[model samples]
Target: VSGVFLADASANDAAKKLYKYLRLVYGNKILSGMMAHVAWNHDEADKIHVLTGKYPAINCYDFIHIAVPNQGSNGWINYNDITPVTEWADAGGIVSLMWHFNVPQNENTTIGADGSGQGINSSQTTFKASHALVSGTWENKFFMEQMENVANVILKLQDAGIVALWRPFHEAAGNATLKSGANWGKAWFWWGEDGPDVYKQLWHTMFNYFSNKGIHNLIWEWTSQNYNGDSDIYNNDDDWYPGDAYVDIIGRDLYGTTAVQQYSEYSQLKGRYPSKMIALAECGVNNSTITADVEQAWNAGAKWLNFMPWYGESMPSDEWWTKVMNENVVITRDEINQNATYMEESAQSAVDNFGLGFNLGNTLDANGCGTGKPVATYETFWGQPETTQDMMTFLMQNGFNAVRIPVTWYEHMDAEGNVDEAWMMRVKAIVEYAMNAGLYAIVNVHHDTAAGSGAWIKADTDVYAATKEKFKKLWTQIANALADYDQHLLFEGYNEMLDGNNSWDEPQKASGYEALNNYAQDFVDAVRATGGNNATRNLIVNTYAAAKGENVLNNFMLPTDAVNNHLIVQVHSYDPWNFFNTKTTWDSECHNTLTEIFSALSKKFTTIPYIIGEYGTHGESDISVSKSSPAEKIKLAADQAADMVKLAKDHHSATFYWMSIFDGSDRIQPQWSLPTVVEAMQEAYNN
Candidate 1:
């Protein structure tokens, strides 16, 4: 802990008074930035302008929590440091009486010059005796003087156009000071480490004193430095100083390192207390590794992520910041300064294009209608066109002779549970464009994301039955609609339908094997039932879960004998799903390389036709192939496609790219969706 918060105190005067209070309250553990606290005070008003834009202003009566300890010890936080408050007020941000500080003096007097603090080692009786009058004393002349000094900070801040946010004891050091799990960093408070009894007493004492003193900037941010932030709360209200009414913002402090714990905890906390605005009150990632951090945090549903760069420390290397910004995340000042409008447009573009998939952002599937959706986001602008027709045209214009358009018509269904006409027309029009280009177009429910749930299974049953009917009607319509087209058109029944029991475990559900087979049978019955072109349409059905290779060999059960041998059993080929879906890289020594994977399947399913219904690389920047040159990356992608193709030829079947257009443009998603991989795929296929 820096000695700044303890600065200016005569050895035994107010300066030391606060220090004594800290020992009494926090048990002699020294906190950091003692000097920074004083520094924050010296420039509170000016700095307020720098920080307040991110928070909302609430009514003075509604309660808000402010973090500066001594700066807020004086009854008022300089008006200007509270810009977010004012902004919040302007935008309907509510305010009420909020708690503020349980001022933990930044300096620790208990440490031998080396560094330490007391309450942890002291007796409870002594602890209580030492803190008995501290809050009251601070509330007296000392607090008034502190308040006046804060008024000056506020005046300076106001002159500088900053607004003051005044909620004292908001997120104080009580529960935060309580010793948590063993995972706490090297030095931490163990004062109340015995149990939360004293912790509760201190809390009750502080709130009673603050409330009695009539120092009204009390927006309690009930702080708990939880191990698993959401799940690992401090024992109880015994540790929760102000109780519920005293809380305005349920705040947490986390670092990029603890992001997983933080997120899991956040979800648990939200489920427990849905009304409060859960915040990352203080957090940051020091190293360049913040890329995954930023992405993960955002995905965790954080309403606001407040980051403080290495405070006044050396700036991170330019290379680090550059890479961070390149990931299309993090609203950095530099990116804002460099391409403000473009970044803003990019943000809007993400939101606008956020719902282009199958269910119009319906993230779940209620019926058997396939819910397996490509985990895609539409941000790729590779100069082709945004529309599917245009993108398909671009592919055909290139050497690409086939197009696999993952369709999510489930999103377009009406309230009555009928698929939307406009959406269907859109789906049909896009497919027609690909077919017109003399390309084999494969379309299926693209966003079949959560296939292993009860609702999903139920929905699959209802939807697929309907979908099978529609599949027949649509093919019949297509048969009549495009009867003039060449026989080159192959109708793919279900894309990547997993096997009977443990289809790659899930492209469906926990035990959806029976469900999968039954549906595929229904699908075959529905389509083959249509007879004409629908019968001999060179139909393709994805093997259970698209479990290619030996995995599929174990599970692949073709729909009961209702079709011609022209039918193709489709299987998606992505080796090592654990490695593929995660940050893991392409293994040079994967047990099943594409050739080996396909050979396993060919050995068993040689009599049946097969095609890769879907396959691709994982989705994060961390997905490097190995420590070797990226040459392995292209080779791996190529080998996977090539091996499968050759295997298809050997099996006397056809092969369709699991998907087309891996760009962010609904073609695939994220990693495997980029043009680099698409080009890599083309190269692999051609080779």
Candidate 2:
């Protein structure tokens, strides 16, 4: 609402004009709008007038009514009755268009090539079989004809001096979930079934085609459906964003109860593209519910450009409409002003503020012997001295800002799945040490839930079903124990939670991926349920195997947080094992691997925080050089330590080096076994 778009002198004249108008309205007063699916032919607008005795400031339509179908009778609306749209536009109502495009194929072939029904039921397999819309295939030509027809309608509106909000391929995220209540692949629509990459290509293809055809009086509005766990189409709004160059406004279709309309999605969208206008593209009270939540949402900093209520039973009653429209902040049709100035505010991102960190690895997260065995003490299990206040104090004094404490919990639980009070107190005592040192403390469920480690939490359906209750119980205790702590103490769900009992390098099986997402969701819900600082405390979720493989990274979904932007992604890295034994070559080689994986994560999750919970050069022995060698091994370890910290800093991620090397005994006594390595780590961050 407050930024400028650089437009070329020869930019599509119509689009430029429409952009100017939208900017004017958005710059003026915040507006309220309305949309009815069949408004072009149906007397839906008249019904609104009869009920509320007031017309909405803006009106909308969909292209399903006018799209030139490849087959079948596309009789959703009469395209020639342009009277309805034009009349509304001439009466100072903003015009918007959304398209629910049908598959371009023969009517007789309702069954797709892959056996899924065409249209909404088309599987990704069937959709990708038809070449991309920009690939110059027969399907592309057929689709282009449909685009051309929609362009004709835009031109007709332009001729009548109308500017329209054009949104196409709505809900690209659909088919992601199957009708069986699982998401394996694809969306419900043909265009979306192939996923975001193809959907983005098609959007660009249509934009170029329209501009080239001299259809310009349009403002591009990119719309998505709200994220629903059961619907693939609604989730993953970030996957299909076509970038700011191709979009003027961003919107989402919202439903559910009033509480669910926090507009957290707007916070995310604004985080990524602050310059673009954000709107409630489509929404209504579910089951005719009423609340002042919409106005409260704006008060909570959502500052949406406008709200467009849907028609029919979903619409609000006259009393509700009048109450909202009468608010001083709401702008009706008579109140629309094109020359008002509004100041824009941007939310500061927490991830950007998180600096360097280290890990207390192989300590709390380590089990004594194996699964179900009682951990005698944190020190005995990991072959280290008991963690003390001095270890945390030394870390803070040596340039570390955060400490990640990993704990494995199943062994500490009783028959009723209750966490042991002694174990809880012990963990809290350690957390207090970190917090007392002014270090951000991250405590996560560790090896107890990992694969092939006698872990109960498995990334598969049957295992998840059996262990979900226990998983909740463990987290409830963990959250409650630390709920009273300050915001500096964070809780991570689990560490390196994997698939197939122990598959790190391999792709996660579909079942494992789904189960992992559910665990993350449940983890967030449990912590939020604890209330207090825990409700908004920062949390981290890991990928399958916590690996950096392409398949694992891409498939990892950020858990939906009750508190937005408080979630951080955790991943571990130990790349290039060959260089671990070498001294000079280790630093640069390890840095390269870190760069590649961190770049991939940043590309996919542009606005989220990331922490490398475990990362180090693991050599054949505890030392990089053989035990017989001292000076050479210490120098090699120092180089690796320095480079790991530097590279993670370069990538804007907090890093936690593995433990045992930075032993608790050494930190407490101030007689570190490898003082040189510690010095190098300190110097790296100090500089």
Candidate 3:
């Protein structure tokens, strides 16, 4: 409740939402930011990218030239030229704006002083901040003019749906010396002149004035100096506190500090003001790289939301910049928008519970309805026994809690593209058996998308031009039929989608990948439209060929979803087929391929959790290769299966064994032919 105070009671919806997002990011992760030029093209951020290969999550701009003169831009910089800030917000980065305001002390000032043009140099300016509050005075008129300039810039961001973090009157409490060395405390700038009382009054005037002028998209941030001992003047940071209602976040602009020193200040600020979000709002790399400070602070239990380094000669060198930008805790610009809507922590626990599983493969996924064969015969067409409640119970009793039921939909469709009623009823019965036996059941369109005359789920432009509509209708009817099911039911879009050429994992045309993405999007939209639990049900999509090729990983795109924690990225693997069928060890290509694919996927699919939807060895994939599985390499296959499950869990995924170890007779009897494979996988799951 302390830091949960509403941001600016008059804040618009956009501003409040951004604040909420910051709250979500506070304790567990730190966002990256950079101070850069205000022009439309931010060359400073571009330089950061060239050096570090990562962009900051927040882009900062200061309107110093709007009021102060000749330091950079002429007399005044354009307030409307906030294109860079506008562009950053669209890319899912935060926007920050501040003012280095001037008063009645410019060279051309007619208010009084003729020798005053030292723009922001505290000793040279004669303008009194207190005098600006006096009625009908020249100082008051000059102050309000700069206020208008800052206000209009903010109004533009508001109209364009960009919320800005306004940190004004920065570094208000500048110290003179330590413990007075005799000259203890003093203000560094004209705004902080006199004392904290004058500064507070100035802040109130601007806050009230902006509220009166329709500026509701700004989040107020007040910068407080670090712990400077008990010395007076500007010593006590809290002396400058503007109360909770006036500020949304409290920032400490620390420089030349160690990780221990920053942690101390983070501690000091946390205890001093527990009612606001705290940040290392502005800092420079002096004693240590900013990376160490954030890493150590996070380890030491400091919950700063973000740290923005100043852009100047004092900024971190390229060496330290690369380290900080790539640090595990730092959320860079590329990943900011990926998880704007987050997955609930509990959903991950559910995935971990999926542990090890097996696909009810070849049965429902089997194709060929030559001569319009009876619907009941499809389950046994692939030489697999009819699945029943007892088969699901056998998996549950053997330490497995998930099963994938792959069904070929188009093979059972009528001329109108409607699913055959009996076929769907049988699929529903198998799904119910799995759930009733206490297992998570995944269902997907399978062999209908595989090669041969049975294939139709093509990743070709012309093929999907007509197929996309049928695909959408296909999912809609499936979702509507299963709308009443709970989270235990998961829906996968397709299985190993090939092009019109029936391609597997070869180099594909860009448009081929484009069609796969379109199909993924169609599946997501069609399922969500069914309402009920489908709105929040687990929906899965896959990369092209359902694989982990480098090109496929780069080409994969997550389907836009209307909900969170419900979409999953699915992949299938039967890796190093040569090694599995021949002689292999736990340390061979079998283990390496399993290890590498999960490692590769965890990078691109950060937001969407993945599962090894189908994985196994030679015998399971080939009846001819079945001898190598449980015959001579049985022990090695069992150990390799263990490693595969362990690596999946290590990378936050679940692995499902394909069907061959347990043949048609074994399944019909609800027993495992290669019992050690089940024994090893179960042991690995908990391990």
RMSD of each: 21.8, 22.2, 17.9
- What's the TM for model 2? 0.48
Q: Is candidate 1 or 2 superior in lDDT?
A: 2
What is the C-alpha lDDT profile of model 2 across 272-333, one tens digit per residue? 44456677787677755553355666655455677877777677677777666666656666
- What tens digits encode model 3's per-residue C-alpha lDDT throughout 287-354? 45443456666555444778888766558778777777778877888876532433222245456557
lDDT of residue 28 for candidate 2: 23
Q: List pairs with backbone clashes in candidate 2.
A: 14-216, 14-217, 15-216, 173-233, 174-233, 175-186, 175-187, 175-188, 177-232
Question: Which has the higher TM-score value, candidate number 1 or candidate number 2?
Answer: 2
Best by lDDT: 3
Task: Please write out the lDDT profile of model 1 over residues 267-334, one tens digit for every residue.
Answer: 44443333333444444454544422444554443323232222233222345334434434343222
Query: Stretches of candidate 1 above 4 Å error?
Result: 1-385, 388-390, 415-417, 448-486, 496-511, 549-552, 561-563, 578-588, 619-662, 665-687
Provide TM-scores for the models: 0.37, 0.48, 0.50
Candidate 1 contains a number of clashing pairs equal to 77
Alpha-carbon shift of residue 5 in model 1 (angstroms):
79
Q: Which 10 successive residues of model 2 have the least lDDT summed?
A: 340-349
Each model's backbone clash number: 77, 9, 0
Q: How far in Å is the alpha carbon of 75 misplaced in model 3?
A: 88
Query: How would the candidate models be sorted by TM-score, starting from the highest?
Result: 3, 2, 1
TM-score of 3: 0.50
Model 3 stretches astray by more than 4 angstroms:
1-347, 619-631
